Ligand binder design. Structure first.
Ligand SMILES: O=C(O)c1nc(Cc2c(-c3ccccc3)[nH]c3ccccc23)nc(O)c1O
Ligand SMILES: Cc1ccnc2c1NC(=O)c1cccnc1N2C1CC1
Ligand SMILES: [Cl-]
Ligand SMILES: [Cl-]
Ligand SMILES: [Mn+2]
Ligand SMILES: [Mn+2]
Lengths: 402, 554
């Protein structure tokens, strides 16, 4: 039997155009979808269905894997998966010593999809050079990548996990989209034994990557530790600290600024006054801790900004209002787009664990270039929302590492 | 015939009924024409007579071609009420992506729409009425049994029907290539002339089995085929013949048309240029205004007319070989490229001439051109080409590893095709010893449009100018421009304008603003420039002083 699903009030289906794909990915999708159709998972559709959602192929191993971009359908289904059948996010997950991510997407293909909703899940396998019309399908079962799937499947999931949870009361298990996050405080060996155990449970129902959240540390804003200081050095310092003060209560620059008296040469060395030195220590002390006064608001979007730092290094912040940083961090290791792709997946994984939401990304790269290459390196089974920006050179500077 | 293919189910929009538009009274000759047309359509089964109970109507009209009448149905109301359909207009093939064939045959389907059945349950909504003379008596009522002309769903339903019909034939003849466009079919093969003809005959017979008539060998068009502004043979392609007018006087209309023709030809004629012609259209208003060609435009046109003098064709794609893409700089902002598999037999050519923003350099532009060509290549051939670029590995790598934006380009290599792209200057990474430090700033009034720019220096110097017709931002650039003119070959400059910093820091080599261009000249002249920033009104050393200066009277 199927659960009835509705779109949000007066919203229509998605009508998103399919992206052009390389030859090898088209071949892969063709074979994947032929097999899925033979197995009843999807059916061919006619021109009387005007909806479309883009589809991609990713390399998961050397076995291709279909990835459907349901970002728009998700947005238009939000009342359903969030308020009607929401899945609560445990605050305990982020405190665990180890968290393993499991793909349980295969689960969905054994639950039929509400017949009247099927049309909205239409997609198209394109041809090269538009030489033939694209092949059109829609889903007959819960699709991977749709936020409706876990929401609908969750009472089955609860029943599935019930024995395991009862037998290991200190293990935290959290479902987000196609994945299961499983956290414990066990030594690494014993943790892995429990994960294998969980998979056995899962396996009886056809459901068949290690994080360490309590080892996620704020990435402080760093103040230079100098032998001697030039006017330039002090000028940089004050700029940086001035920006910091828009975020962290208590940041002081008064004393440091005294040193900048008169119209002086950039390279002139200038000895620190003992109190400026103190001012510096205190600011340094404050920059270690999370920002006093910033709290997550569950009715608001998360935003994530990333800056390219050079030499395979990248900085990022997560906030809901600029400079109310909920989290700041870094990623390290050359192919700029591959690295950015990796950092985006990492930042998204942390946000899911921490808040149970994905951030909308501000990406320091031209739209077309990202669109061209992101799927070459993508491995995750979700896709965050994103947009493209030009990093203000000073923002880069102020978040610089050492 | 009417195809025995299953119909596509169709519905009106969720909260809507069928149309009910009243038939306008028609003149007698047009009533006659319609009775005669519908009588035939009726006998062929295209329409059926209906009763008075059917509550719906849509206006019909008739228009004299020639000495022939045509039946027109105004389906706006119905179209407004009909569901959306899967888009058919999703893109066309580029000839350069096609594979060469020994033979290609075109077959047009006769009375295409009228040869495809309409959803039984939807027919009622297409009811129309031939009005009686002066509307005295009830009109003759018909509804459609087939896809009507001018109805929303026809294009998409026709195409999906043709696709289903072709399906078994394609499965049986995997080495025959068929392209569908509107009511035409392009059928290509590598068979020898005799067996190709045989295969066409089988296609026709298969098509006829499914209700679709086509021209026989005697009536089939001969190559080259004209399609979408191209002209196609089995073994090469080009754009449709273009004749450039020879005229003394050129209206805006003429120049617009000429530019479109040139832009179109540029996909196979290498070197086509339109910049000088385009400048002529600047701020252009009346399509009838005559615009005197400038000497440069006159030469550009001539240089074009010469490129077009003799026919050029592109070759087709061979999937077993790599794509090679070469790019050359032509002028400023102007780029040109060619794509081939064997040198120098172009599959296609192109030009790129877009400014992303007001300020860029050649390294950024070349990278943008590479991206554009890369996207195009995926679309056309489903794979990336190997590039030959007029830039040194080191030049490109120094730039991108230093710049704050991310990028990646497909495999490439340097080719020595001047002009080469280089970096025209590089700002220092560290402040300069024994170089004068200039603190700069600027002010302007919001309702004055007046303002000042100036500098103070660590060696005691200063200056302030007055700017008319300027912004708070333009003054910021003026100040830096001041500092540059009055300084030695090495200078340190301290601004408090992120705006100005942003611009200069990106290391531009061209710009829309003449101010910026002037600054660019200065930067290229210097031996060393360090540029730094400080927050305004933090009581910083020399910044406070110059703020004071330029803010006087403002
Ligand atoms: O050059 C600029 O961008 C510039 N901008 C301003 C704008 C400005 C700042 C400011 C403070 C710290 C860092 C940056 C701006 N603080 C202000 C307070 C009131 C009004 C305007 C401003 N005031 C100036 O005097 C000035 O020179
Ligand atoms: C207009 C058009 C669009 C797409 N493909 C083709 C054509 N027409 C051709 O004439 C053609 C020429 C050469 C090779 N394929 C061609 N064909 C393919 C079908 C044999
Ligand atoms: Cl980790
Ligand atoms: Cl200007
Ligand atoms: Mn200023
Ligand atoms: Mn000022």
């Amino acid at each position: 039997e199927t659960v009835p699903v509705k779109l949000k009030p007066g919203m229509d289906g998605p009508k998103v155009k399919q992206w052009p794909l390389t030859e090898e990915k088209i071949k892969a999708l063709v074979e994947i979808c032929t097999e899925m159709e033979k197995e009843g998972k999807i059916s061919k559709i006619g021109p009387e269905n005007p909806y479309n959602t883009p589809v991609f192929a990713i390399k998961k191993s050397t076995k291709w894997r279909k990835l459907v971009d349901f970002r728009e359908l998700n947005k238009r289904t939000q009342d359903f998966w969030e308020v009607q059948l929401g899945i609560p996010h445990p605050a305990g997950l982020k405190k665990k010593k180890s968290v393993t991510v499991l793909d349980v997407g295969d689960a969905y293909f054994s639950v039929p999809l509400d017949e009247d909703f099927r049309k909205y899940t239409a997609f198209t396998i394109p041809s090269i050079n538009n030489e033939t019309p694209g092949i059109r399908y829609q889903y007959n079962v819960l699709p991977q990548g749709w936020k409706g799937s876990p929401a609908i499947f969750q009472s089955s999931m609860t029943k599935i996990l019930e024995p395991f949870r009862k037998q290991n009361p200190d293990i935290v298990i959290y479902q987000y989209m196609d994945d299961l996050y499983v956290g414990s405080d066990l030594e690494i060996g014993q943790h892995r034994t429990k994960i294998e155990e969980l998979r056995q449970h899962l396996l009886r129902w056809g459901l068949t990557y290690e994080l360490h959240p309590d080892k996620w540390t704020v990435q402080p804003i760093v103040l230079p530790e100098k032998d001697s200081w030039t006017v330039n050095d002090i000028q940089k310092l004050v700029g940086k600290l001035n920006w910091a003060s828009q975020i962290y209560p208590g940041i002081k620059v008064r004393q440091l600024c005294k040193l900048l008296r008169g119209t002086k040469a950039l390279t002139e060395v200038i000895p620190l006054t003992e109190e400026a030195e103190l001012e510096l220590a205190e600011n340094r002390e404050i920059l270690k801790e999370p920002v006093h006064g910033v709290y997550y608001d569950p009715s608001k979007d998360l935003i994530a900004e990333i800056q390219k730092q050079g030499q395979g290094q990248w900085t990022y912040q997560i906030y809901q209002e600029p400079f109310k940083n909920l989290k700041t961090g870094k990623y390290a290791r050359t192919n700029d787009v591959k690295q950015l792709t990796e950092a985006v997946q990492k930042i998204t994984t942390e946000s899911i664990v921490i808040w149970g939401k994905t951030p909308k990304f501000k990406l320091p790269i031209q739209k077309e270039t990202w669109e061209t290459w992101w799927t070459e390196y993508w491995q995750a089974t979700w896709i965050p929302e994103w947009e493209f920006v030009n990093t203000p050179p000073l923002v880069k500077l102020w978040y610089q590492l050492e | 015939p009417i195809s025995p293919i299953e119909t596509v189910p169709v519905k009106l929009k969720p909260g809507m009924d069928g149309p009910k538009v009243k038939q306008w009274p028609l003149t007698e000759e047009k009533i006659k024409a319609l009775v005669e047309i519908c009588t035939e359509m009726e006998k062929e089964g295209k329409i059926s007579k209906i009763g008075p109970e059917n509550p719906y109507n849509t206006p019909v009209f008739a228009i004299k071609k020639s000495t022939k009448w045509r039946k027109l149905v105004d389906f706006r109301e119905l179209n407004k009420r009909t569901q959306d359909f899967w888009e058919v207009q999703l893109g066309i093939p580029h000839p350069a992506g096609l594979k060469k064939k020994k033979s290609v045959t075109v077959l047009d389907v006769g009375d295409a729409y009228f040869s495809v059945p309409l959803d039984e349950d939807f027919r009622k909504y297409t009811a129309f009425t031939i009005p009686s003379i002066n509307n005295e008596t009830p009109g003759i009522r018909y509804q459609y049994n087939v896809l009507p002309q001018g109805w929303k769903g026809s294009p998409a339903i026709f195409q999906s029907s043709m696709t289903k019909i072709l399906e078994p034939f394609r499965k049986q003849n995997p080495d025959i290539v068929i392209y569908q466009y509107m009511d035409d079919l392009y059928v290509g093969s590598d068979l020898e002339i005799g067996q190709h003809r045989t295969k066409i005959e089988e296609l026709r017979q298969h098509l006829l089995r499914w209700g679709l008539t086509t021209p026989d060998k005697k009536h089939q068009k001969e190559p080259p085929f004209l399609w979408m502004g191209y002209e196609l043979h089995p073994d090469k392609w080009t754009v449709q013949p273009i004749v450039l007018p020879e005229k003394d006087s050129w209206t805006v209309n003429d120049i617009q048309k000429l530019v479109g023709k040139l832009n179109w030809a540029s996909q196979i004629y290498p070197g086509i240029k339109v910049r000088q012609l385009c400048k002529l259209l600047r701020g252009t208003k009346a399509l009838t205004e005559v615009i005197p060609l400038t000497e440069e435009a006159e030469l550009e046109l001539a240089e074009n007319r010469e490129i077009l003098k003799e026919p050029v064709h592109g070759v087709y794609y061979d999937p077993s070989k790599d794509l090679i893409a070469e790019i050359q700089k032509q002028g400023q902002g102007q780029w040109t490229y060619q794509i081939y598999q064997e040198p120098f037999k172009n599959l296609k050519t192109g030009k790129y001439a877009r400014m992303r923003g007001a300020h860029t350099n050649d390294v950024k532009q070349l990278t943008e051109a590479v991206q554009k060509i890369t996207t195009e290549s995926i679309v056309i051939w489903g794979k990336t080409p190997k590039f030959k670029l007029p830039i040194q590995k080191e030049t490109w790598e120094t730039w991108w590893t230093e710049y704050w934006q991310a990028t990646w380009i497909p495999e490439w290599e340097f080719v020595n095709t001047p002009p080469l792209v280089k970096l025209w200057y590089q700002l220092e990474k560290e402040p300069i010893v024994g170089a004068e430090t200039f603190y700069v700033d600027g002010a302007a009034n919001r309702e004055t449009k007046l303002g000042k720019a100036g500098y103070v220096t660590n060696r005691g110097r200063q200056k302030v100018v007055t700017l008319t017709d300027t912004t708070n931002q333009k003054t910021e650039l003026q100040a830096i421009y001041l500092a540059l003119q009055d300084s030695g070959l090495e200078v340190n400059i301290v601004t408090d304008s992120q705006y100005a910093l942003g611009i200069i820091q990106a290391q531009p080599d061209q710009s829309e603003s003449e101010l910026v261009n002037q600054i660019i000249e200065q930067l290229i002249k210097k031996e060393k420039v360090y540029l730094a920033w400080v927050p305004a009104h933090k009581g910083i050393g020399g910044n406070e002083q110059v703020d004071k200066l330029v803010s006087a009277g403002i």
